[PDB]
């Protein structure tokens, strides 16, 4: 669902940024949870309670881990992006989704 897809997009951006650093390299695409919350706040808004948004983000991350795209959190509030993301956010899939979503917005009028 498109919330999971938004988190997927952000994760894919972070993943490609990581892959630049050392090519494909290892599977250690590490990120801090505090980095994601600022991103989501822009789209999902600000419910005005930092803890509430943290819980929301953790719920989404749990769903994604259910889809196998992210490791569960750890003691340092870090997660590592599963490489499987590269084949779900495949530019072909991204463009198909983008066309569908452009259609959606056009209809929204």
């Amino acid at each position: 669902n498109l919330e999971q897809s938004l988190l997927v997009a952000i994760l894919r951006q972070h993943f490609v940024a990581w892959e630049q650093e050392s090519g494909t390299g290892a599977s250690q695409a590490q990120i801090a949870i505090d980095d994601l919350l600022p991103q989501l706040q822009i789209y999902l808004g600000d419910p005005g309670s930092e803890s509430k948004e943290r819980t929301r983000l953790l719920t989404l991350l749990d769903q994604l881990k259910g889809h196998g795209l992210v490791t569960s959190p750890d003691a340092h509030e870090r997660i590592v992006i599963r490489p499987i993301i590269a084949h779900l956010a495949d530019p072909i899939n991204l463009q198909a989704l983008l066309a569908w979503l452009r259609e959606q917005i056009a209809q929204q009028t």
């Binding site: 669902n1 498109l2 919330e3 897809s5 938004l6 997927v8 997009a9 894919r12 951006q13 490609v16 940024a17 892959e19 630049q20 600022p38 706040q41 822009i42 789209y43 999902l44 808004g45 419910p47 005005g48 309670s49 930092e50 803890s51 509430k52 889809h67 196998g68 795209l69 599963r82 499987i84 084949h87 779900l88 956010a89 495949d90 530019p91 899939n93 991204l94 463009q95 198909a96 989704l97 983008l98 569908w100 979503l101 452009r102 959606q104 917005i105 929204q108």
Partner: protein, 451 residues
């Protein structure tokens, strides 16, 4: 308030106003009601909670300032206010006057004024504020300075909004690196240009010469010590003003937090010297995100739409094999009844050593008995003579006590010449003692305290 503390404090406060029955309220769980109300006010943007604590939004600050400006309000149409306005208008005019001769004349009259004040003060005719007028003159500075917090309450919000705008704009695919740096500089400068911006900038300039802010804080500390302060302000208002400088310094931190937060996503975005495929997917994602903003995220049903993304990394599990079933165990059915019986101790076990300690020599009674006995003896008395005239039931500690009294009173002790005494313990075994020559005297001994 830490949130867990706020819930309970507000539950208690609600329990108080259950006697205000004209307002409908829940009467079966005043704790749950507290959390529900707290959430509601979170929704209204009345209170914003961060890092687990809670803080009052500017809206609630102003609303409080409203009711407090009803009957119990403070007053500003004051001779103190007029003195402030007069002095500060003089200052403003003199500053705005560009003619150097006029400034020279103004300073020539001000120097003479202050010299006359110095002459009076040196004459012993110093004058204080009428102790009663002090209450109003302090209320004046309090009310005057109370505005600054209400102003930072909005400086913070303005910079937060600027940072949020920078975020939602940086997503734009049309934006390139040169656009982003330019927008950062322009946004920050424009924010600094607005009135609240100049307020923040002046406050910052004060810090470069911290001497003045620290001097102000010290003066305020002195002021609130003077007795009249207690009449003018309660403990709360004094608590604020005493640390107004600190509360401003701390409050500006959120501004710097927003600034650094925006710089974070400038930095994370300028590094985009990518390879080919990464450059392609970056454009794809940026365009998709720019599309994303247009939707109505607040809507639940918009949110739970199903995208057409293909199923990859698919997994299959939970094959419903009937044989996989297993069933409960209850075989540990033995009941361990309660050991409610009172196992309180019986003193028979107590070892004799504990009793031996329980009969510790009472020092003070020995002091009193010695002073009494040496009163009637009225002459120097050696320790052996004390044992003879007084049986030391608990033995050694007594000799130490008597010699200690001697030493405390400055009584001479000649360790190199000796006396002796014989004694016996509680079970009859005899003992002998070697002691130094010395003499106790009642008058000198009782001349000093004891414990």
């Amino acid at each position: 308030i830490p949130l867990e503390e706020a819930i309970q404090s507000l539950s208690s406060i609600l329990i108080e106003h259950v006697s205000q029955e004209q307002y409908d309220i829940n009467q079966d769980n005043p704790f749950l009601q507290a959390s529900r109300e707290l959430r509601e006010w979170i929704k209204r943007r009345l209170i914003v909670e961060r890092d687990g604590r809670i803080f009052a939004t500017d809206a609630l600050e102003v609303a409080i300032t409203f009711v407090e400006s009803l009957d119990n309000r403070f007053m500003t149409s004051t001779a103190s206010r007029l003195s402030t306005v007069q002095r500060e208008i003089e200052n403003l005019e003199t500053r705005l006057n560009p003619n150097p001769a006029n400034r020279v004349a103004t300073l020539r009259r001000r120097i003479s004024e202050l010299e006359r004040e110095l002459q009076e003060a040196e004459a012993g005719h110093i004058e204080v504020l009428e102790t009663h007028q002090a209450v109003e003159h302090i209320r004046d500075v309090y009310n005057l300075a109370s505005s600054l917090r209400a102003d930072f309450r909005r400086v913070e919000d303005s910079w937060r909004e600027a940072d949020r705008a920078l975020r939602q704009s940086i997503i734009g695919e049309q934006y390139h690196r040169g656009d982003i740096v330019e927008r950062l500089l322009n946004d920050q400068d424009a924010l600094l240009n607005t009135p609240e911006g100049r307020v923040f900038d002046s406050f910052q300039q004060q810090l470069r010469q911290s001497s003045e802010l620290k001097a102000m804080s010290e003066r305020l500390r002195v002021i609130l010590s003077h007795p009249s302060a207690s009449d003018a302000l309660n403990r709360l208002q004094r608590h604020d003003l005493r640390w107004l400088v600190k509360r401003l310094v701390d409050e500006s931190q959120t501004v710097l937090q927003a600034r650094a937060r925006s710089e974070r996503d400038v930095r994370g975005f300028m590094k985009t010297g990518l390879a080919a495929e990464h450059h392609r997917v970056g454009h794809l994602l940026n365009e998709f995100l720019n599309l994303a903003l247009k939707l109505d995220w607040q809507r639940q049903m918009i949110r739970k739409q199903e995208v057409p993304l293909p199923a990859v990394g698919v997994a299959v599990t939970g094959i419903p094999a009937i044989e996989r079933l297993r069933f409960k165990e209850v075989d540990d059915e033995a009941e361990q009844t309660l050991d409610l019986s009172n196992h309180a101790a019986d003193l028979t076990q107590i070892g004799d050593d504990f009793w031996d300690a329980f009969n510790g020599l009472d020092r003070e009674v020995l002091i009193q008995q010695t002073l009494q006995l040496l009163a009637k003896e009225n002459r120097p008395v050696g320790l052996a003579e004390l044992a003879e005239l007084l049986p030391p039931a608990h033995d050694l500690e007594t000799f130490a006590v008597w010699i200690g009294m001697a030493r405390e009173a400055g009584i001479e002790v000649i360790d190199s010449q000796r006396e002796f005494a014989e004694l016996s313990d509680g079970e009859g075994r005899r003992w002998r003692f070697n002691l130094p020559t010395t003499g106790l005297e009642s008058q000198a001994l009782m001349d000093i305290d004891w414990e």
